[PDB]
């Protein structure tokens, strides 16, 4: 599953 802190400017939603 993807790590959401690799780029915190991405909201996965």
């Amino acid at each position: 599953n993807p790590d959401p802190n690799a780029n915190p400017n991405v909201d996965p939603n």
Partner: antibody, heavy 121, light 114 residues
Framework: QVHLVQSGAEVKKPGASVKVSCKASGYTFTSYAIHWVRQAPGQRLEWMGWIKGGNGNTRYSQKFQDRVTITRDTSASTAYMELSSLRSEDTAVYYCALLTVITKDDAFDIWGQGTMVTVSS | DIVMTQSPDSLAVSLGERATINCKSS????????????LAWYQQKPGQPPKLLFY???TRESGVPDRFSGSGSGTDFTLTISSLQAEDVAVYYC?????????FGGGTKVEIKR
């Protein structure tokens, strides 16, 4: 217009240190993270790390963890990358970038003009 | 370290011809919970910073002409320029933001046969 303006290119002797700066405008500086990316000669792009412009939390690549410090200044809306104990293999263009701002609100991607750092005696 | 492999490394076609650029992700970068691939495509002309073209593999950025499209999922992705124009001579980079460290493909140089 969102602009990332980056300090001028620099010559540095090996072992010394370089502090390149990234001035933000055109966007809420404290809401997004400033990434730093190296483009070494002929080689590919390399992510170095990011700092979050509100709370200042950083995360660093494992290639630069020990020699780079990224800091920000909320007042001047300016993020800074400092590389220390410079090697002649650090000669590259260094970029700051709001990498892939994909928020439910807005979507953009802005890079500064690059700062070329040459390490030489 | 998710390696991104671009094929070809250099392609040259005549004006108007279709250029296809393939990018392999070394790890599957689709997330089955939100049905998104975490890939971007960039364009870089000499002496200039890269310029985003696509996010979530297929989503075009504002400004990018419609001859550019992006497709792919899982481990295999594609950038297509349906009718190459002079402005498109550049180097193109794929890029993933699935995991840390953020990484980037090797690049594909695009030339025009004239």
């Amino acid at each position: 217009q969102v602009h990332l303006v980056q300090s001028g290119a620099e010559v540095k002797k090996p072992g010394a240190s370089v502090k390149v700066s990234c001035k933000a405008s055109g966007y809420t500086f404290t809401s997004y993270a400033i990434h730093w990316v190296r483009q070494a000669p002929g080689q590919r792009l390399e992510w170095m790390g990011w700092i979050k412009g509100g709370n200042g939390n950083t995360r660093y690549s494992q290639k630069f963890q020990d020699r780079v410090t990224i800091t920000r200044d909320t007042s001047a809306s300016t993020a800074y990358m400092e590389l220390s104990s410079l090697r002649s293999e650090d000669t590259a263009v260094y970029y700051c970038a709001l990498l892939t701002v994909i928020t439910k609100d807005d979507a953009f991607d802005i890079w500064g003009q690059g700062t070329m750092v040459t390490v030489s005696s | 370290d998710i390696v991104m492999t671009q094929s070809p490394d250099s392609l040259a076609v005549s004006l108007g011809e279709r250029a296809t650029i393939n990018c392999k992700s070394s790890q599957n970068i689709l997330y089955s919970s939100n049905n998104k691939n975490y890939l971007a495509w960039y364009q870089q002309k000499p002496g200039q910073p890269p310029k985003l073209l696509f996010y979530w593999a297929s989503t075009r950025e504002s400004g990018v002409p419609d001859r550019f499209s992006g497709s792919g999922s899982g481990t295999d992705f594609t950038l297509t320029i349906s009718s190459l124009q002079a402005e498109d001579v550049a180097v193109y980079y794929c890029h993933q933001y699935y995991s840390s460290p953020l990484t980037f493909g090797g690049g594909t140089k695009v030339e025009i046969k004239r």
